[PDB]
Amino acid sequence: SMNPPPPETSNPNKPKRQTNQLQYLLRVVLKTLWKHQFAPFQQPVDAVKLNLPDYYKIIKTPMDMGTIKKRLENNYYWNAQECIQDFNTMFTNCYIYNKPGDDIVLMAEALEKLFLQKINELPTEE
Ligand SMILES: COc1cccc2onc(N)c12
């Protein structure tokens, strides 16, 4: 029923990097998805406000674009794959929790279509 602590966006002992691929994930990937008409995914799922008391019983690896945005802006990642995994976790969580055909599923699908289109053109490491 209650909301858990949000995913980590700051960890000073975690080693960090500022790479061209990570810059692409913020400037191109996150920015395209964030501006979209279907961008429920801009903050962690509020199970209390949205009345989803079983959400966190089912979803054990929560992820959202608000967390991803903070992670990219505060240079939390070491590599592009960590960020790509976060986006994939967010889409997977939506498909696992929600029933097939739901509005929220179609919203995640539209964002995922653009995500795959952008990741297809991930630049080579400089
Ligand atoms: C408004 O967001 C929702 C409403 C209902 C179910 C949901 O699952 N994942 C979400 N982001 C979500």
Domain extents in the chain: 19-122
Output the ligand 1 site: residues, CB below 6 A.
40-41, 45, 50, 52, 94, 97-98, 104
Q: What was the structure determination method? A: X-ray
As a whole number of angstroms, the distance between CA 67 and CA 73 comes to 10
Report whether 68 contacts 43 (CB < 8 A): no
Ligand 1 geometric centre to CA of 78 (Å): 29
Taken in order 109, 37, 9, 49, is the CA torsion positive or negative?
A: negative
Atom of ligand 1 nearest to the CA of 97: 8
Task: Give SS3 for 100.
Answer: coil
What would the CATH number be for the domain defined by 19-122? 1.20.920.10
Enter the resolution in angstroms. Answer: 1.9
Number of residues written out for the chain: 126
If 0-12 CB within 10 Å is exposed, 13-18 middle and 19+ buried, where does residue 39 land? middle
Of 93, 54, 49, 66, the closest CA to residue 7 belongs to 66
* Exposure letters 88-122 (e unless 16+ CB within 10 A, then b): ebbbbbbeebbeeeeeebebbeebbeebeebbeee
